Amino acid sequence: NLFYLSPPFIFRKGSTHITFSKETQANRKYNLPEPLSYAAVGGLDKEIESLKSAIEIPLHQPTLFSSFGVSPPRGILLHGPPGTGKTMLLRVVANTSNAHVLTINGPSIVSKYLGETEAALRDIFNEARKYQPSIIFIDEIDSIAPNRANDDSGEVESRVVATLLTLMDGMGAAGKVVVIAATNRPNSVDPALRRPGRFDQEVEIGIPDVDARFDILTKQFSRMSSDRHVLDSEAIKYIASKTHGYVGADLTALCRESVMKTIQRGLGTDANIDKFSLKVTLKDVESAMVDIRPSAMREIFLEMPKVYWSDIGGQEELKTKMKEMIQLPLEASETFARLGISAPKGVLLYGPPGCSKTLTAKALATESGINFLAVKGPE
Amino acid sequence: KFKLPAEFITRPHPSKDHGKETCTAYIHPNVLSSLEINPGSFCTVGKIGENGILVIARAGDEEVHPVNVITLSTTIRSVGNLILGDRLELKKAQVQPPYATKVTVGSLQGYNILECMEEKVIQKLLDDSGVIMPGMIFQNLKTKAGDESIDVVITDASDDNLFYLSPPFIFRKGSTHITFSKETQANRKYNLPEPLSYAAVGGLDKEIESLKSAIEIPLHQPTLFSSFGVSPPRGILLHGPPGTGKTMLLRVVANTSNAHVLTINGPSIVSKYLGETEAALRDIFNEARKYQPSIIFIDEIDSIAPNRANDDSGEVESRVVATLLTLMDGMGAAGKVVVIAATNRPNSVDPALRRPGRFDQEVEIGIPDVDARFDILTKQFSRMSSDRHVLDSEAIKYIASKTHGYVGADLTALCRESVMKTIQRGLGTDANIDKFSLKVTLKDVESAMVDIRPSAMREIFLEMPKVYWSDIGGQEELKTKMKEMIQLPLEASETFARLGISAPKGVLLYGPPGCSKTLTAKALATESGINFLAVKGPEIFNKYVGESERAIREIFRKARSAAPSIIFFDEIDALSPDRDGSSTSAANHVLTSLLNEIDGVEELKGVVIVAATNRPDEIDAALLRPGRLDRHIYVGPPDVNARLEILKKCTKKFNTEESGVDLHELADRTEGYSGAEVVLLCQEAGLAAIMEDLDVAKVELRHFEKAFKGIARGITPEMLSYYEEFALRSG
Amino acid sequence: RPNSVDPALRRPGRFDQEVEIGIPDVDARFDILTKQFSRMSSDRHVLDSEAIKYIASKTHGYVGADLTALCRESVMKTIQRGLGTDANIDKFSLKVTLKDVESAMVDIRPSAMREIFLEMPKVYWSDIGGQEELKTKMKEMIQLPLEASETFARLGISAPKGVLLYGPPGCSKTLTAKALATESGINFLAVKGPE
Ligand SMILES: Nc1ncnc2c1ncn2[C@@H]1O[C@H](COP(=O)(O)OP(=O)(O)OP(O)(O)=S)[C@@H](O)[C@H]1O
Ligand SMILES: Nc1ncnc2c1ncn2[C@@H]1O[C@H](COP(=O)(O)OP(=O)(O)OP(O)(O)=S)[C@@H](O)[C@H]1O
Ligand SMILES: Nc1ncnc2c1ncn2[C@@H]1O[C@H](COP(=O)(O)OP(=O)(O)OP(O)(O)=S)[C@@H](O)[C@H]1O
Ligand SMILES: Nc1ncnc2c1ncn2[C@@H]1O[C@H](COP(=O)(O)OP(=O)(O)OP(O)(O)=S)[C@@H](O)[C@H]1O
Ligand SMILES: Nc1ncnc2c1ncn2[C@@H]1O[C@H](COP(=O)(O)OP(=O)(O)OP(O)(O)=S)[C@@H](O)[C@H]1O
């Protein structure tokens, strides 16, 4: 009657047929945990190889540095805006590397009794020393190791930061141990904790480029079945160029919302329709994208009633020049790049009240595709 | 019933210089019996959490040995680098280790000891051990000359990795063979712990003499003070910026000083119960007093002893501080105990601890200068010693000259990153090269400098392009004057020291919009070599009463740390009203902080201040004085040659050499243009060419004429008259 | 911290009498130094008893433990002087010359003065060309009231304890502050404006 993660069976030669297959993974029926791998991470290629180097040499080839008379780099810190995939990197590092894996999940170690938070850290680092090689993860380091000089950091923060400092570089030794940390606020981490010897490397993990977003979208859509209908490159490339300022969590939300839109369309067609054949068509992605907001833009509220160029009566000169400024440098990038010329990046629209000044700004906002931040004089 | 302790304490053999004892661990017979380790059997000893050494048990006098103490000679203690007072885990050996054929007798003083010594006694000294391993040292063996002594090392043994730190071997006499060498260290593939020594510390000669004076006499020569009737000292407080060598000095003192060593690593003693933190301190000090001479180390003493008047310091903190005070200087005497504490924040340690009898000396471990840095780099590159090709002492001196602001940890990181550049170079030529066979050339140190910023500069995120002095057209006088300040003081330092004069520390760049001011800031940030800080005008201001001044003080602090350094004050007039009666209190206090921090009661040594302004007559006189903003340099609209250089640089990727346009005619045409207007002319011309077609070939004179017709001259004779009548003062 | 103790304990019948062990003045300093130099009594040579009054007169801010540190560092300085003259001179045979106490005073700053971290390179009254009236008036306040204390007590006057230095930028106002820090002898604190 017991409950198992996988059914137990016994092999009895001859009487149990060893039937071959080509499926490279276990049967999907079972909900077996499936290893996360680097192939699921998009972009960040150079950062991924930097993580590989700084994880591999300290743990799996230390005698190379001992041969060269230098200490090993026992620290990596990942910083960059939220949603860029910092915890994804920590989980893939955990699941890929063969090492003792320990985690300080910020507030998970914290206690209201005087010395217990510090004792949790000492036990974690002594376990890492005991079993080698070892990787210690600290997601949101800034939650347990604040600046220690600012006003709100009292004695408790001082003692926790001191424990981290002394367990990384103090009278005690390290061993084949590497500490990997992630933070959205690198400068809120204590300044004496980022010196070489502690978090020597600061592998920045920033917002994706157009190439990075294309990579993330191809890898996200590779997870699905043959119900995509988005041409592996072209449609995904259009979606990647149309996403500006996206970070990667929002792109996953966009894919999930596209699935939601396709299946709600299916329900609106008929309740008993054969959904699985309802390919997510690019218009479903479009309907999804209008219902998501870029990570860097949730707080940019706009009423923006979707102005288009044809609404502006005349002003053909202004329209041509604003096409020059906003559209062309992206639609003809290689030409400007090869001429060594950066397009003009500022314009002043001046004229009597009630002309097309603000309306042209709104038209740029809702025709250029790029983001659009607005300001007013006395606000 | 007898209770078995969980942790034993190392202590020294009192008995003898040498003998068969050299592998015997005397233990309390209660413990020996309880563990069934009868005398003569094989037992293992090791630091907690680590593999163990193999030794021979013996029983100690019941009335002298406490239960905790295990007694070991220097020979065995050298193997695992066991410092007296280290906590041991003792265990019985399940299996007798095998026999080796090779005994690799090394030397520490490096002589041909077989000539300096009679090997017929060396054989006895090697034989007596019974067990043999890599690492065992033998000490103070008198030479044939008698007046001198030698030390010996067993570097390795083998026969022709888990549960054992050093591979244990048994001395099967006759099958064992000597393989003598001058080598001083064990095979690094074993990965034994390498003892620390003072020779690994550089740039702290005076501080090292101070610590040695304040440790040796109080511990190993107390009768000297008693003869004079002065009480011995009890403390040293090492302090200084993070990364300067404090904990390294504590580790070296622990390794080299022949005293019982106890440690308090930050709040390692802080406990949830009401009186356990005080009990821990009292236990530590009673142990120190029981096993004199002893040293009690306290890292992060600002974390177990705050100021006790600070708001956050409650009763727990008060009780701990009181315990320290009473244990160091109270009604009971502490004996021959020296407390060496390291702290990055000396003023957070309670004032009562910082007075004679508690912390007599406070030794500052400061940021290394050029020579201290040369020492550090020499010592590390000597720790390399074959894989370098960085040699002749000039390349390391060059690196010391180039790595400004480095603190000592950054230098270790530089060596490591240079090694990694070597590894990836080797991969760059052979994807399977032998990484143990490479060498780290000066190219690699230079290639690592570009990825290591000083720890002082970590907070200063300035994402700037790469602007060269070749980008700035004209401004030759400005370039010469800026070189005189930025690079000459560092290249011609000896000449300045000889003439007795230091270079001026400030320049005010003033001129009309669009002429080279901030561009020179970027050029310095790229070409200067010395560290660059920048404040973008009113960036510092804050609604609160005392924060806008703290921003100034903090930026100047960060510049002091990273000296030599450049601070660029962009549009400084935002910070410096004229004090003619304006009621803007925050601006006036910012101005006063800036004044008193450029040239005030404390001098500003290595920082050079650059400030750019559009409206230079609005700046205060006290700021423009010599000593703060020494020399005023006018950056005006480019002349014909400067325009022409701008055009040649900007129009390079226009295939102008084909036909149509002629840059000299243009340079003459654009009189009165700011440089930005010339750049705009080129940009708009390229844009018009793109409009006539998406070619990549060439622009035409039609495009330049069209662009010229659009750009208006933003600089007027009133502006130039203003700037020239300001300049008229200099004469 | 007398006020940190509960008032109920600071009541007659529980803590009847409170005794204030204050900071020693010149006479207390001299008594302390006489007794700490009496325990030495033969390795000393400082015994003129005018040398000890001299030292006491220059030990500004010394609280009583600083004087012990002073004697100890004097022993160390004479030790290292002996080693400098001869490589293996018997350290037990040396004597503590007055020069040794003077050379120790350059290292021991009072415990009350240990929170004040001021860099302040050396500057001397000879570096400040001119300003002779200023130098005379600064001496009249910083040194005469300590050199001529008994005369002031006889005439019944206290010297003025404030001076406002004013003038155009670039003259020796802050330079005089650095000169005072280097050459006044007495302790130096500084507040840098809106700090
Ligand atoms: N290539 C990718 N880059 C980034 N995020 C991805 C990527 N692929 C999937 N994701 C999803 O985006 C999220 C990335 O993890 P997050 O933890 O949200 O990132 P993070 O916010 O930087 O880490 P935190 O703040 O410590 S939770 C997860 O929900 C992933 O499922
Ligand atoms: N070609 C046009 N010229 C002027 N107004 C136009 C034009 N086309 C449409 N409009 C309308 O006229 C009004 C002008 O509004 P705005 O574009 O805000 O003018 P405005 O000059 O920006 O006014 P301000 O900013 O308050 S001075 C809006 O209702 C527009 O929809
Ligand atoms: N010759 C040297 N001189 C000084 N420092 C050195 C030298 N060689 C290496 N170092 C580095 O200096 C550092 C010594 O650490 P410390 O500066 O004492 O630590 P800290 O950040 O100041 O605070 P704590 O409490 O002492 S860990 C280590 O990172 C060493 O690698
Ligand atoms: N030789 C040159 N001289 C001046 N400006 C140049 C030159 N070459 C390029 N520029 C352009 O000049 C622009 C303005 O740079 P700066 O001269 O630093 O402006 P500025 O002098 O600081 O004027 P203010 O005081 O900020 S309004 C840059 O964006 C460059 O593109
Ligand atoms: N005899 C002297 N008189 C005046 N200044 C001198 C003299 N000798 C050298 N100086 C220089 O003059 C500078 C003036 O320094 P400060 O005392 O800071 O001036 P200041 O009186 O404080 O003016 P302000 O109000 O601070 S701008 C010193 O830093 C020296 O470099």
Swiss-Prot record, chain A:
ATP 1 binds at residues 80-87. ATP 2 binds at residues 351-358. Changing residue 355 to T: In drg1-11; severe loss of ATPase activity. Severe loss of oligomerization. Resistant to diazaborine-mediated growth inhibition. It comes from the Eukaryota. It is found in: Cytoplasm. The first ATP-binding region binds ATP with low affinity whereas the second ATP-binding region binds ATP with high affinity. ATP hydrolysis mediated by the second ATP binding region releases RLP24 from pre-60S ribosomal particles whereas the ATP hydrolysis mediated by the first ATP binding region is subsequently required for RLP24 dissociation from AFG2, probably by disassembling AFG2 into monomers. ATP-dependent chaperone which uses the energy provided by ATP hydrolysis to generate mechanical force to disassemble protein complexes. Plays an essential role in the cytoplasmic maturation steps of pre-60S ribosomal particles by promoting the release of shuttling protein RLP24 from the pre-ribosomal particles. This step facilitates the subsequent release of other shuttling proteins such as NOG1 and allows the transition of the pre-ribosomal particles to later maturation forms that bind REI1. Essential for viability. Belongs to the AAA ATPase family. AFG2 subfamily. Present with 799 molecules/cell in log phase SD medium. Homohexamer; ATP binding induces oligomerization. Forms a ring-shaped particle of about 12 nm diameter, that displays 6-fold radial symmetry. Associates with cytoplasmic pre-60S ribosomal particles containing ARX1, ALB1, RLP24 and NOG1. Binds to pre-60S ribosomal particles soon after their export from the nucleus and is released before REI1 and LSG1 are incorporated into the particles. Hexameric form interacts with RLP24 (via C-terminal); the interaction recruits AFG2 to pre-60S ribosomal particles and promotes AFG2 ATPase activity and RLP24 release from pre-60S ribosomal particles. This is ATPase family gene 2 protein. It comes from Saccharomyces cerevisiae (strain ATCC 204508 / S288c). The lineage of its organism: Eukaryota, Fungi, Dikarya, Ascomycota, Saccharomycotina. The chain holds residues 207 to 585 of 780 of the full protein.
